[PDB]
Design a protein around this ligand. Sequence first.
Ligand SMILES: Nc1ncnc2c1ncn2[C@@H]1O[C@H](COP(=O)(O)OP(=O)(O)O)[C@@H](O)[C@H]1O
Ligand SMILES: Nc1ncnc2c1ncn2[C@@H]1O[C@H](COP(=O)(O)OP(=O)(O)O)[C@@H](O)[C@H]1O
Ligand SMILES: [Ca+2]
Ligand SMILES: [Ca+2]
Ligand SMILES: [Ca+2]
Ligand SMILES: [Mg+2]
Ligand SMILES: [Mg+2]
Lengths: 375, 375, 126, 160, 74, 82, 82
Amino acid sequence: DDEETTALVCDNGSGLVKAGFAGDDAPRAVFPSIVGRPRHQGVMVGMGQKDSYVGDEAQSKRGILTLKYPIEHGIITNWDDMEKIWHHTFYNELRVAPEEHPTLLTEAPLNPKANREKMTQIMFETFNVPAMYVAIQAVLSLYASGRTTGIVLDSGDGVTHNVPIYEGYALPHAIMRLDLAGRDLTDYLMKILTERGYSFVTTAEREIVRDIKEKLCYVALDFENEMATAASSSSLEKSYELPDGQVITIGNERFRCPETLFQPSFIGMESAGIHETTYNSIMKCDIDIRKDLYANNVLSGGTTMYPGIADRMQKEITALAPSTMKIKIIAPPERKYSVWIGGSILASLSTFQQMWISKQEYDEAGPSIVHRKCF
Amino acid sequence: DDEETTALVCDNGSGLVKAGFAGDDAPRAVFPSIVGRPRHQGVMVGMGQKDSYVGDEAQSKRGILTLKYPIEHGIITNWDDMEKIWHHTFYNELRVAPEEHPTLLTEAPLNPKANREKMTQIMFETFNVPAMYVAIQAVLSLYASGRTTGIVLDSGDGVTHNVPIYEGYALPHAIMRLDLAGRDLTDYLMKILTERGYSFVTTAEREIVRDIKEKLCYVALDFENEMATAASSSSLEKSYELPDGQVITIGNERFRCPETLFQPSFIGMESAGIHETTYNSIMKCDIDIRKDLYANNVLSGGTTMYPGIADRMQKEITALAPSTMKIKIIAPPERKYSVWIGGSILASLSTFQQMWISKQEYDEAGPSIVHRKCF
Amino acid sequence: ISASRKLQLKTLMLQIAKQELEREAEERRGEKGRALSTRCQPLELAGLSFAELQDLCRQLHARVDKVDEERYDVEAKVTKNITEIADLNQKIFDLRGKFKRPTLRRVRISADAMMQALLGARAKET
Amino acid sequence: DDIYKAAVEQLTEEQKNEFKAAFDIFVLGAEDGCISTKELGKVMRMLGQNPTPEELQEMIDEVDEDGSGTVDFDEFLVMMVRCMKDDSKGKSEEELSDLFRMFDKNADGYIDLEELKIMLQATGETITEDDIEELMKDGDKNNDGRIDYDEFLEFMKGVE
Amino acid sequence: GKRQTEREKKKKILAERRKVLAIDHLNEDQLREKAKELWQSIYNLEAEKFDLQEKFKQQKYEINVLRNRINDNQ
Amino acid sequence: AQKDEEKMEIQEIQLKEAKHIAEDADRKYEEVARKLVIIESDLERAEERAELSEGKCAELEEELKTVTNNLKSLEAQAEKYS
Amino acid sequence: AQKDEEKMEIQEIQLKEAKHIAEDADRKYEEVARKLVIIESDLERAEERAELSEGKCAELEEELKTVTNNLKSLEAQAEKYS
Ligand SMILES: Nc1ncnc2c1ncn2[C@@H]1O[C@H](COP(=O)(O)OP(=O)(O)O)[C@@H](O)[C@H]1O
Ligand SMILES: Nc1ncnc2c1ncn2[C@@H]1O[C@H](COP(=O)(O)OP(=O)(O)O)[C@@H](O)[C@H]1O
Ligand SMILES: [Ca+2]
Ligand SMILES: [Ca+2]
Ligand SMILES: [Ca+2]
Ligand SMILES: [Mg+2]
Ligand SMILES: [Mg+2]
């Protein structure tokens, strides 16, 4: 590289911040988005103890911290912590001053306006970027698949949203946003582990339960048969070693944790599973583009990485859909970073180069410029 | 081919534009005449999205367009869209510049003058043709049958008109133009389908209802007997698969949709059916040419393609007409393109070669030349 | 065979193409000069009285109006060509494209950098 | 590392052995005078950033024919130095389009085999049967004996 | 009407880029200067016409190439 | 002894990572195998459907020609009556 | 020292087992992936063939319907003519 100017494709997310320069294949720095103040007193003098460890540093000292995510469900609830996370991302994980780089944030659909306006105001006043643009997290995941149609189910860690798109024309009346995501699955797993004796309570042990969920849980092809099998044999019980020994054995908690996605009544949510909100999102579309959406169903986001979900979802939709249509579920192996790869592709386009929100434009219309033509 | 110069036999119609070079058997390019602007927002950048898809391209992207026909009932209501349709027809479906080809448009009888004058003004100023001529849509359909007498009922998609001709001398006082045609039958079918639960509202779904009408509906030989039979047995219920599945079953809506032709009281029109306006058109003629018109009744136009209409119409006219005359209904298998075949034959004649409206003549008398000797 | 020879052949083709483009540009300049010599006859109006000057100016005005009408026709045809080109490019992106997304690579193995940073600079390449 | 290896090829092959020494100074245990299968697999699986075996196979498919990952010296060079990225954006596409326009002399939009021979003669390069056969095989993706514009762009994709 | 639009544009061209050559009362030196400037205008118009001709030829050739590639689409 | 213990610790770490990667590869293999099972089923279904449609087409051709001959005979009959 | 020697030995044995099993699993995955690609190509071909056959069958059905209706009409006409 050299002259010229590259764009910063940041992607706030909720659970893992993924960032990197535009035009690459994978994000340069991926690290949890947690800011944890120490909670004990501290007796050693001169140890160089800081007041807040952010990012991946607080996943190593988590034994004496109180980690707290600054993004609850897509929306940002603690602006100071989010500013700290952004400052860390720019200066220590990428080491590029923001004064010389455009930024491309990402935002979930149907989020509060004030969140987006505050985001752009921060990026323009504190970090003082040249130009920033906010994009919907599902259109990027559709970019990365190299398609131009299809209905994308982006089940992140904060919020699961399902944006249908045809021929490049998004259908704003058919977006079905559901707030069940990876975090609720972690909490439900932590709640059902108590049925064997293992109690995880501290906010640090939520990370251990998350690791258990990632490494062991899988989505059952048929729920009742698995419940019957796990209750007779013992071929499912997989063991796992805690960070201090005392291995634990997970029985039928393995496929009961991610089953909450298809039956949100487990955690008390009323709505229908991710297998039926996709069909409802399709049926709201026009009658002539339903075949294409059926054939190009796209999966993205981290939580769709459970082993065996691309078959359960296809079976469910085939049960719901008319018998003639072909149901195909696109599940690329690079699912987790699909949104960021799409963001890199979009930022690398020449046609897109004039859509950025230039700073002089913000100076003339204020932060409310984001809702205007420069979307 | 080679030297020399061939004529362009265009035929605007209302519902399908049929065009092709003079002297062939079938039109070269046949495509619906609809121009549909996109209606949603559009989020993909650089997708190459145009502002208006015309012709057969808008029958494939109709899921996100708002199709609107530029010709309502013979007359043209939206001149910009009609100009766009003509430009597409000349440049992309035939790929022949109009600067080097005479054109032969077609026009329904009893149409407003301003429509015809504007048509010739467009053809001479925008496309800049060498010479154009406008012909009545029924005389051509009489050419194609190889007759020289006969009363032709040209039930198109916009307007149904009934021009009697004897020995080449048209009878201007006996033309009976009725505005019920295929489009009203489509609307009535879409309105009676709601009696089973199927609701089609969008302007895109009108195309689906049109396909249902084309593929399933038929004209009953006797209406009351069919109504009684369809209400007892179930041998009529034919099913049809929508563009997304969910097959539908059409019962006695099959022969009730095209029955509107013979009883225009169904859609609230006062006038008499196409079975009685032909007899009235005959009775206005002189007493000595009624036998020939009875024996040479000609059918044309798209809407006369319903299975079983050439028998119902003959039965009705035989009921009305005196018992001695022989009633014969000419229904060639190439009914749909009969007008265009006749147009090709007329343009290929040597005797007709001096009837074109040459451009210098238009320059001397203005657009009002069409009403003059060069008709 | 190998690939370096193919690269040399490709570079030779590119240089030949550049030479041909330069030659065509020079030919266009020569033809423009020839057109200036042909159409634009030498016009010397020295010593003529006012009347002949007025007549020749009016005739040149009529000729310039004719040339402007011709240029308007040619420019309209050029706009037609631009419209055709835009339509064809749109059709190509719709049909020949789809899976014609760019193929980018930024994940190069920084092995040589690590070797040069932790083991001196014995490597005389990088 | 294509250009650096190509330039160092002006020297002897024994320099490769010295490379092995350097590689051993990382992961000592090599004895065969080259970056052997053990060294190559271990470095591609351990260096901290792990290229996916899919990525390795796709990069190797440019030169590797058996699909395993084992080759001989010069073929190892052509297979492995080509893996790293040097070219950037492949220059400007419109320049390539204008040069291709000037290429096709008969104005049909295709570069036939005869046009290929004409271009070789214009370059002044020695008439070699092997290079001509290689050009015929490469430029003709659809087995028609000729070359198109997108085929030319593919041929020049990454070539200065 | 777009045909009325093109007629309006042509009429405005006939009334905008055209000057009034009523310079009969000007001096012989000034009339010669005006003739020289007219010659310059003629040269400029012819150069624009030649560039338009070459652009049209290149566009026609590239359109033929794109038509051939459209035949190569399917 | 301490140095040998340290080397043993390093070996333990490397063995752990090797086990992780091996299990990941095993996961990939078994998943792809089950996918192949499903795809084979689907391909067999497609073969069956296509053969059925071909049989339908042949039957339709035969019926078409039969009815066409009937129609021609009736045309001749009607001409005679006329 | 005794304990460390035991740990070193058992770790080395386990590491060798792990690497070997990993390589074997990778080979099995490669073969299964190739088989999956072959079956996918076969499925695509079967789909296109079924589409062609369906189109042909639909066309034949339409034409047969037309001809049959013509036959019925001319049949009735012939009876009346007699
Ligand atoms: N391999 C995996 N298996 C199962 N769940 C995973 C896996 N990787 C990540 N997850 C879940 O997905 C979440 C990360 O989702 P991510 O896509 O990073 O969210 P965001 O959209 O905020 O970036 C984690 O919290 C974890 O619960
Ligand atoms: N095979 C068919 N069966 C029944 N109706 C048809 C058939 N084909 C066309 N139509 C009707 O006729 C219309 C086309 O009529 P057409 O003759 O093209 O009108 P125009 O005189 O404007 O060309 C369509 O809108 C359709 O409703
Ligand atoms: Ca090999
Ligand atoms: Ca050629
Ligand atoms: Ca070729
Ligand atoms: Mg996300
Ligand atoms: Mg008509």
